[PDB]
Design a protein around this nucleic acid. Structure first.
Length: 937
RNA sequence: AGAAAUCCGUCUUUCAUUGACGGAACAGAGCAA
DNA sequence: GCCGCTTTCT
DNA sequence: GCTCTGTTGAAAGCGGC
């Protein structure tokens, strides 16, 4: 069909005094109505029966537990706002058996036995339903009749069956003329029988169209009047009559649709308790308005049904946990362990975890919530806009036009403005380009704003320049006549608003037509994050003459590889925000020198000299952000054991280190080193507070006390937390953008990554890509492969398993204890799982470099101090075998930057001969990316 | 319909009134250290 | 034709 | 910060301006 995504915009409304009063009054009215609907629907759902759940689950192609579905609606935890019939924790099972008329199964019994959070209490909603029948003044069975009708019309969400939308309002409380269900049902059954037994199934639809028209006794131009009475959205039959008489015919689909229609319209909607319900609602909320009652019902109904479903699934999950508890419960080895064979002990560990988890589990209470309300057709259309344009200042106002309820009770529409530079740039500004047309005016969708000149004078407040600049750019795009017009064919836009006046603007758009299972010409790719939180991508193409992959079942071709990178320029100098590690050691001499000045005068409490570790830090000549991380750790050490006066002196030092010249608050990229430096600095302040207040086990320190002692430093605590939040969000968005633009520049249509082994950043990037890719008709899949770091591309599972260890390149000089340590470990590693490959890499290293006498020496060696070969013998031999004392040597280390690939699967790879085997020196991150691209899970 | 407004953010010993750039969002509940 | 209302829609 | 379960309606006619 047609695939569709959603972009959205967010801002805050700016009403004048009177319209703000009206808006607040209207939102409060809707919130009170939603609360009433929550309390009411709680009882309504408590009134359901096993018959209703049986009807709403009958066609569900996997069997459902009806008793549990009745439970999660009859008894639920609630806040004391909705608590009306408190039931004790121990009469849940008894009174459920009373209601249902049978023994409660184990799933429901687990649902009742689970803990509930503090301030949440169990509510018996069936007793509430009985009191609802009393308060309405109607019989219990009459309201049950209307409840069955409502659940059959999909006016309510019953277990697996979703609700129509807010159509309950129109169906039950509506004032217009309803359909004529008898005619629809009769025509539908007649055509169903006339189609179920045919002598010849056609290949087109014209014969079936004529059959339908003959049965209903109408023409192609009168069927809507005859069948639907010219009322409502077009039916399936109406769209079937309307279509071309040459299209393929799908008998099974039409039969299924007719059966659905017959099941839905078998019984009419003759009510019993309609008018009492309407009077109840109108007396309790407001006079009848379809939109307002719809909003109240939507809020309440969603809040209830999400918890109903969640608790249903939670009971079954808890039952499985309970069963797996009572399987590993060997009960004497358990007691010995808590006071000897292999898997009994491991199962006992699983048992401890499981029992702890089972004990702690809380059930999900039903809370009304704090969602906003949506106005339909609220934004004034861009071509309908009222623009007080100026020759040097465009009108940056977007106007809503919302109905508000006045204190008299009458509704009236009003205009309320708001500002969003993004919504103005992408959609709402008046475009005039003669030719150009794009969905959204933003670089990822193909449009770049013109850059600014010395002819553009931006003279505004300082806190507006970033906004003003964009306006200037947009205005320039109009002056040159190059601002594209939005091709979204927008007819109406809704707006969601909360009690704080925040507005959310959703925009839905078609992204293209759905894909079809990787034909020839379709390019795909993969990405992977390495150990240092850096991502790499590898592109591939399906080709005609090429190399076959058993997993994919087609011929594939490597295109290129690369690293995911987001570059910002600064007076011509480029910076990769995702990886920039700061200045080089000979560039921040003054910063390090001031730090040395401070650190010389102090000690660490065993006493040391505290300048000792500082010089240790400087030994390796690290870059600025690595230096800053380690020096934050140093300051944290220097704080651990000091006095109040000493702390004051230290505090003067901390404030400079954080706030001045290179501190994390002024300098720092989006790299892992900066993100860890921020955490280290926060730890500095946390230790300062722990020492100043002299905390202990039995001395808690509430943040109230921390702010009371030092407000100006708790300020930095929140400020650094905010910096961390913003940095991480920016980093995830930039990674997703970089990958998406890499795909766009290359006609990539499929991405493969890791997800649904979970980093915070890997998980976040996977979710962000899953969000962004559909917007460009790019298909994302998720492979949970764990061996991607060692698989050999185009060889692993083509047709058989093939892994190789990961290698590293070292010049002859920098060979030391860390080399022979890995050599001896991997040679000794014969069980590590990924240790066979590293052993075999060590042996290949020995065979290639002709050092087999040293393997006999090294099998015992690599000790802490004594039974080692000296750490220059191997230097001398390898130089003697290469002829130079600075020469690249390949060593199989765990986590190296080099992989030995069979095929050229990384950009810039070169071929060499290792152990009399030809091989390509590839970038191991690119190899992992390629392995991810070629996985089929 | 009311001349104002950074929609939310990032980089740089460079902090910029022509520096270069990034982003579907929201609610509740549960969980994990 | 615009606006606000109704209804049904698989 | 994880997930979990959801939302941000679609499509037609009618009658009064």
């Amino acid at each position: 069909s047609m695939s569709s995504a959603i972009k959205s915009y967010k801002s805050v409304l700016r009403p004048n005094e009177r319209k703000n009063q009206l808006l607040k009054s209207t939102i409060q009215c809707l919130e009170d109505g939603s609360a009433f609907f929550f309390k009411m629907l709680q009882g309504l759902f408590g009134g359901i029966t096993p018959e209703i759940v049986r009807f709403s689950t009958e066609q569900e192609k996997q069997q459902q537990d009806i008793a549990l579905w009745c439970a999660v609606n009859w008894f639920r935890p609630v806040s004391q706002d909705s608590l009306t019939h408190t039931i004790a924790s121990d009469n849940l099972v008894e009174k459920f058996e009373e209601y249902y008329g049978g023994t409660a199964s184990d799933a429901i019994k687990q649902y009742f036995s689970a803990s509930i959070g503090e301030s949440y209490y169990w509510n018996d909603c069936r007793q509430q339903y009985y009191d609802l029948c009393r308060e309405l003044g109607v019989e219990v069975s009459d309201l049950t009749h209307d409840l069955e009708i409502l659940c059959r019309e999909k006016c309510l969400a019953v277990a697996t069956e979703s609700n129509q939308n807010n159509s309950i309002i129109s169906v039950l409380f509506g004032t217009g003329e309803k359909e004529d269900r008898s005619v629809k049902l009769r025509i539908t059954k007649k055509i169903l029988e006339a189609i179920s037994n045919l002598k010849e199934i056609p290949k087109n639809v014209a014969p079936i169209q004529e059959i339908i028209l003959n049965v209903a006794k109408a023409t192609k131009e009168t069927f809507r009047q005859v069948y639907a009475g010219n009322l409502g959205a077009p039916s399936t039959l109406e769209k079937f009559i309307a279509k071309d008489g040459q299209k393929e015919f799908d008998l099974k689909k039409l039969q299924t649709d007719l059966k659905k229609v017959i099941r839905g319209k078998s019984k009419e909607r003759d009510w019993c308790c309609q008018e009492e319900l309407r009077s109840y609602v109108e007396q309790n909320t407001i006079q009848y308005d379809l939109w307002a009652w719809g909003e109240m019902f939507n809020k309440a109904h969603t809040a209830l049904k999400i918890k109903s479903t969640r608790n249903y699934n939670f009971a079954k999950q808890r039952l499985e946990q309970f069963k797996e508890i009572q399987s590993l419960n060997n009960l004497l080895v358990v007691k010995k362990l808590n006071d000897c064979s292999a898997q009994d002990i491991l199962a006992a560990a699983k048992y401890n975890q499981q029992l702890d988890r089972y004990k702690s589990q809380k059930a999900n209470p039903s809370v009304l919530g704090n969602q906003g309300f949506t106005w339909t057709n609220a934004v004034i259309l861009p071509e309908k806009a009222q623009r007080n344009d100026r020759p040097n200042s465009l009108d940056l106002r977007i106007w809503l036009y919302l109905k508000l309820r006045h204190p008299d009770g009458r509704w009236k529409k009003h205009h309320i403005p708001f500002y969003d530079t993004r919504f103005f740039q992408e959609i709402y500004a008046a475009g005039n380009s003669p030719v150009d047309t794009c969905q959204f005016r933003t670089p990822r969708f193909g449009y770049h704003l013109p850059k600014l000149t010395d002819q553009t004078a931006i003279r505004v407040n300082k806190k507006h320049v970033k906004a003003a600049k964009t306006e200037a750019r947009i205005r320039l795009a109009i002056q040159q006549g190059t601002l594209p017009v939005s091709n979204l064919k927008i007819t109406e836009i809704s707006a969601t608003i909360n009690s704080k006046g925040q507005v959310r603007i959703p925009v839905k758009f078609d992204v293209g037509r759905q894909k079809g299972t990787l034909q020839i010409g379709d390019r795909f790719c993969g990405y992977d994050q390495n150990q240092t939180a850096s991502h790499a991508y590898s592109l591939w193409e399906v080709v005609k003459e090429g190399q076959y992959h058993k997993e994919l079942g087609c011929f594939v071709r490597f295109i290129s590889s690369g690293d995911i990178v987001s570059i910002t320029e600064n007076r011509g100098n480029q910076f990769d925000q995702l990886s920039y590690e700061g200045l080089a050691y000979p560039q921040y001499a003054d910063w390090r020198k001031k730090a040395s000045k401070f650190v010389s005068l102090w000690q660490i409490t065993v006493t040391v000299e505290a300048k000792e570790k500082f010089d240790a830090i400087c030994k390796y000549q690290p870059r600025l952000y690595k230096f800053n991380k380690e020096y934050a750790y140093l300051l944290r050490d220097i704080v651990r054991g000091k006095s109040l006066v000493e702390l004051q002196q230290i505090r003067q030092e901390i404030f400079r280190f954080i706030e001045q010249d290179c501190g994390v608050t002024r300098l720092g990229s989006l790299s892992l080193s900066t993100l860890e430096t921020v955490k280290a600095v926060k730890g500095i302040i946390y230790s300062y507070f722990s020492t100043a207040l002299n905390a202990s086990k039995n001395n808690p320190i509430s943040d109230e006390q921390r702010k009371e002692f030092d407000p100006e430093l708790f300020a930095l605590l929140e400020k650094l937390e905010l910096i961390r939040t913003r940095k991480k969000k920016q980093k995830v968005e930039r990674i997703a953008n970089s990958l998406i633009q890499t795909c766009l520049e290359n006609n990539i249509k499929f991405i493969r990554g890791a997800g649904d082994s979970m980093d915070w950043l890997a998980r976040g990037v996977f979710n962000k890509i899953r969000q962004l890719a559909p917007m460009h008709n790019i298909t994302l899949f998720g492979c949970g492969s764990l061996y991607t770091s060692h698989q050999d591309p185009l060889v692993h599972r083509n047709p058989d398993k093939a892994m190789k260890c990961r290698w590293a390149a070292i010049p002859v000089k920098d060979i030391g204890d860390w080399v022979l340590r890995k050599l001896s470990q991997n040679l000794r590693a014969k069980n590590i799982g990924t240790g066979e490959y590293y052993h075999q890499g060590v042996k290949e290293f020995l065979s290639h470099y002709e050092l087999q006498d040293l393997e006999e020496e090294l099998l015992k060696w690599r000790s802490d101090r004594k039974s080692n070969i000296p750490c220059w013998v191997l230097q001398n031999r390898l130089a003697e075998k290469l002829g130079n004392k600075e020469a690249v040597v390949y060593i199989p280390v765990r986590g190296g930057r080099i992989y030995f690939a069979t095929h050229k699967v990384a950009t810039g790879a070169v071929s060499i001969v290792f152990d009399q085997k030809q091989v390509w020196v590839c970038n191991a991150d690119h190899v992992a990316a390629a392995n991810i691209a070629l996985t089929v899970k």
